[PDB]
Design a protein around this ligand. Structure first.
Ligand SMILES: NC(=O)c1ccc[n+]([C@@H]2O[C@H](COP(=O)([O-])OP(=O)(O)OC[C@H]3O[C@@H](n4cnc5c(N)ncnc54)[C@H](OP(=O)(O)O)[C@@H]3O)[C@@H](O)[C@H]2O)c1
Length: 174
C-alpha cells in the first residue's frame, strides 16, 4: 500500500500509526517536536508538520479541534490533499459548526473527509463495532478513505456529504 501521513503523535495517532504500519502502509508523523519520538514506531518517519504534509496525499488529523488553528498557515501546502477529520467533542452541541466543516474552511483547498471518530485509541490493537461512518463532499476522496478503512479490518458506511458530519460527531456522545 501507499504512504499515509498522521498529524499528531498522541494516543490516537500512535495507535492508528502502528496499525497502519502493521497493515503494510508507510507512515509519516507530523509533530510540533519531531526530536521527541521515543514512544513512536521505528518504522514511521517523524517530521515537522510542513514537511510531513508534502510526503503524502492522505493526512489523518490526529489533533483535537481546539488546536486546528496551525493548519491556517499550512493551508497552501495542504492543497489538493485528503484530510481525515477523526475528532470528537467532549460534549453535545459544544460548537455550532461540525469540526469537519470548521476544518474545511480552515483549509479550503483540501478535501475533508470525516471518518474513524467512533474508534477508541488502542481498539485496533486489542481487537475489541467494526463500523465506520464516512462523509464528505468529494467521492474520490471518500472512496480513498473507505479503502483505508477496509484495509484496517473495518466496515465503512458512506453517510453522504460533509453536512452529515455533525451527526457523526454526536454519535459517540449519545
Ligand atoms: N483518544 C481516543 O480514544 C480517540 C478516539 C477517537 C477519536 N479521537 C480523536 O483523535 C484526535 C487526537 O486525540 P488524542 O487522544 O490522540 O489526543 P492527544 O493524545 O492529546 O494528542 C493530540 C496531539 O495533537 C498534537 N498537537 C498539535 N498541536 C497541538 C497543540 N497546540 N497542543 C496539544 N497538542 C497538539 C500533538 O502532537 P505533537 O505534539 O507531536 O505535535 C498531540 O500528540 C482528537 O481529535 C480526538 O477527538 C481520539
Amino acid at each position: 500500500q501507499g504512504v499515509v501521513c498522521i498529524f499528531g503523535t498522541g494516543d490516537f495517532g500512535k495507535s492508528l500509526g502502528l496499525k497502519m504500519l502493521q497493515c503494510g502502509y508507510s507512515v509519516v508523523f507530523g509533530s510540533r517536536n519531531p526530536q521527541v519520538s521515543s514512544l513512536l514506531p521505528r518504522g514511521a518517519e517523524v517530521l515537522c508538520y510542513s514537511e510531513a504534509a508534502s510526503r503524502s496525499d492522505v493526512i489523518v488529523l490526529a489533533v483535537h479541534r481546539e488546536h486546528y488553528d496551525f493548519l491556517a498557515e499550512l493551508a497552501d501546502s495542504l492543497k489538493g490533499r485528503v484530510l481525515i477529520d477523526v475528532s470528537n467533542n467532549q460534549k453535545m452541541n459544544q460548537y455550532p459548526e461540525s469540526n469537519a466543516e470548521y476544518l474545511a474552511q480552515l483549509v479550503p483547498g483540501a478535501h475533508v473527509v470525516k471518518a474513524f471518530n467512533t474508534i477508541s485509541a488502542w481498539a485496533l490493537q486489542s481487537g475489541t463495532s467494526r463500523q465506520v461512518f464516512v462523509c464528505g463532499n468529494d467521492s474520490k476522496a471518500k472512496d480513498r478513505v473507505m479503502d483505508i478503512a477496509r484495509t484496517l479490518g473495518l466496515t465503512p458506511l458512506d453517510q453522504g456529504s460533509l453536512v452529515a458530519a455533525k451527526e457523526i460527531e454526536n454519535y459517540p456522545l449519545q
